[PDB]
């Protein structure tokens, strides 16, 4: 007679068939060897088990043989067609989401129907996982000298992370929070990458910081173990919070500067790259997403309506000005990449790249837009320094209309033609 074993991902808390279930989850379904419940030695044999005998440290001992591995439909992963036998059930990293996942059980099959009228071939069973919630990010500017985080400055992220609660008498995996920082960052400064829980610092000990390349770009992961890790279960709905700081280094060519990051219930050995993505993968919880808009001017210089050429050049920087066209009050000049002033090249040409001009992201939890510019004058605007020989500098500044909004994701650009006159 052949059996089934149908697996309900539910989740909750055991105290349960009344709990949601969860499509996505994924098992891996094994056959405990050399046991044969039909006979008083099996049956004495399987009530001796231990279940670290069977599957210790996160992978399958000898004592077992895989038999299928599988998705929850509807709720409910099917294994069909089974021989009669004991069978390890164990719930696998990489479902649809990350989850605290339920830990191995043993079923068997047949089963005698609980009432005692008959077997049971097609068999039920009930296990717990608990959510992750998505972990919040934001950017924040950390040096208010210059408003926002335009390139040739530093842009600070925050990643809340909430520890959700977990079965009663369990202990977390692992504990992994990594970030893919987007390519046109540099290295993360070790000095200001920051770990707290529920608002403390943790010890230097328990929590492993690391960075590593994964093609272009650095991934940071933070890293719980230890104390910290193994007592993790009694800070639950409490916030880890990991910041750091990185370079601006050059403007992304859409013009999105865009950055998530993932929590993984678990502690790999191999270094994790959270956006990979095969069926195999470790799947982590990704965050609430940040992206910020970055904008460049072009100045098209021309004298009495030609091309300047070899022996004509003008100068100019970039500022912030109110309604009416004056300069904001103690405006400094704009610096681009270490620049604060732009001169127009033979061709007329001088481009004024990598200005951010604010950022999209998750606020008392909807999506925003904030102008990183806001509070400072309504526009930036150009103020020529320096022309050529026998013409007039122009005595406003020349507003030019860049700004971005919860819906921009290209370049945002603005060109700006200048007739320098006689
Ligand atoms: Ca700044
Ligand atoms: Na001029």
Known sequence: ERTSIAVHALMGLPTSIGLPKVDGMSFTLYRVNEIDLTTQAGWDAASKIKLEELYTNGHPTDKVTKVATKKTEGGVAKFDNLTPALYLVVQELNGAEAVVRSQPFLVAAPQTNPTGDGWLQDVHVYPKHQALSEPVKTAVDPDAT????????????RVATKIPEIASNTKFEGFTVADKLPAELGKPDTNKITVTLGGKPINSTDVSVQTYQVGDRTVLSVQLAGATLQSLDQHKDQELVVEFEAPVTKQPENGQLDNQAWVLPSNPTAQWDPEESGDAALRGMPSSRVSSKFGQITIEKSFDGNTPGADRTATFQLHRCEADGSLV?????????????????????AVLSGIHLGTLQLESNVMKYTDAWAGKGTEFCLVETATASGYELLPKPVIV??????????????????????
């Open 329 to 349: 009050k103690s405006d400094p000049p704009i610096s681009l990449d270490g620049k604060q002033e732009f001169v127009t090249g033979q061709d007329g040409k």
């Open 401 to 422: 209309k860049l700004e971005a909004n919860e819906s921009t994701n290209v370049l945002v650009e603005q060109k700006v033609k200048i007739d320098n006159k006689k």
């Open 146 to 157: 210059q408003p926002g985080f335009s390139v040739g400055e530093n842009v600070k992220y």
